[PDB]
Symmetry: D2
Subunit: 123 residues, 4 copies
């Protein structure tokens, strides 16, 4: 499967570092370090991936979450990345993400940012 | 914290069932059953939540992922929900979500659906 | 078509007011007044809709944009709503939206909010 | 303002062509031709932009809509792009977009795709 291809250290276009282990069962576990935002050092992440993807040249669907609290900082927010892994010489994880931060109900309409990150195996 | 308030069974507006356990460390673990889509029975989920949220009336940021493969069905896709938990008599988890399915690179522009789910403690 | 059904005044769940005219050619023109945010009084809007939708019970795709500058206020931002009109006794426009605000390149990863608005013919 | 900088022909990463005129009043009008999807030849577009942006190095917020019906084809859908214009030697329009297609109410949870397009002045 893509277990071997996904497991390892990845980098996105902002300079962030995504260290992950793909389990045989479809589990993703690791750490995330963001180069931007209210973030410092490494944060726990967990997620899931398709462990038996199609064999027609389609990518491998996956997703993971980081809550932005660690021993150093708390940003009262969480980001989820949703995307697909694309193997080969230029292996990539192409994602879109949603960052929700805690708000009062009056401000909840403004609680969620959306963006896109592309992860590669080389900085 | 919100550990007690989050842990348990939740229902969204489509009839789906979200069974989760909030850990003291910020972990979310459980199962998801979707009332719609290429889905059948329960699927593994994992995620994260802010375990020390603000005490100013703001909600509690969280997120989780489901890869849509179980023993019965594989839909070559994954959904991430990003949102906040709002406690009280009418407790709610308000989310937006991203569903990515595996595609060829030529079709990757069309690989991601976006939506919103509101979860409540009563069906 | 849905020209008659779309044209008119609509209200969303925040209390905002969406006044629109659907043209025979697929044009949407009107004004938007937001009950929340850095907004005051009415703002110009323009958009487009499917003027020959399917007749199988599917909704009518449409979209529109507001730039958040008028004679009174400038919020250096723009929102686009994308959704479908659903006719009948409980007529609805169900949307998701993207709000982008002007940022420096260093902050561009955080420039876009995402949400969802449901518009009805009654307040 | 950015009227001169925005007006003209733009190209995104898929090969699509975005021809627009920025009006003094904040209007965007033009045509869109998509290199991908259920699309053929040019489609009408309309939108809005911030005509008095900040002068602190922030980008210029804007948005526009295309309904995917012309004389040749009807795809019962509409896309809205929301983003900012960034001037200079490497001028760019960075966007995220929402594509909604008409659906029955039972399938409405799956009606909206999300993505991101970067437009440049050179192919
Ligand atoms: O910045 C963060 C956490 C880090 C996000 C990095 C993102 S994840 C997507 C993208 N990909 C990356 O690799 N990095 C970035 N959360 C914002 C929470 N705050 C709102 C907010 C929104 C925009 C800008 C700054 N803040 C609210 C708040 C609560 C308490 C204190 C301060 N602020
Ligand atoms: O349907 C699913 C999995 C279940 C999603 C339920 C969602 S999660 C968000 C929302 N909230 C809920 O509680 N339920 C719904 N994935 C679609 C994957 N397929 C694309 C697709 C897109 C739209 C409609 C149907 N299919 C691709 C494909 C690969 C192989 C076979 C068949 N299809
Ligand atoms: O608030 C607005 C314009 C009004 C948005 C109302 C939305 S549209 C979606 C939803 N539906 C509705 O009917 N109403 C709401 N733009 C924020 C721009 N600012 C960022 C921002 C982000 C979050 C909260 C406040 N500001 C940046 C900025 C530039 C200069 C000065 C001040 N601020
Ligand atoms: O393809 C389109 C219109 C063209 C979209 C091009 C996008 S806009 C964002 C991105 N940026 C670009 O420059 N190009 C692309 N609409 C899909 C509507 N159909 C769903 C759909 C979803 C995914 C793939 C194909 N179809 C439904 C349907 C109704 C009737 C017949 C056939 N299909
Ligand atoms: Cu912040
Ligand atoms: Cu499917
Ligand atoms: Cu603001
Ligand atoms: Cu189609």
């Amino acid at each position: 499967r893509d277990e071997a291809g996904i497991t390892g250290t990845w980098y996105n276009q902002l300079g962030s570092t995504f260290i992950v282990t793909a389990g045989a069962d479809g589990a993703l576990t690791g750490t995330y370090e963001s180069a931007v935002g209210n973030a410092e050092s490494r944060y726990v992440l967990t997620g899931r991936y398709d462990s038996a993807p199609a064999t027609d040249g389609s990518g491998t669907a996956l997703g993971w979450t980081v809550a932005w609290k660690n021993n150093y900082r708390n940003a009262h927010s969480a980001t989820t990345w949703s995307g697909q892994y694309v193997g080969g010489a230029q292996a990539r994880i192409n994602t879109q993400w949603l960052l929700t931060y805690g708000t009062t109900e009056a401000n909840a309409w403004a609680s969620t940012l959306v963006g896109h990150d592309t992860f590669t195996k080389v900085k």
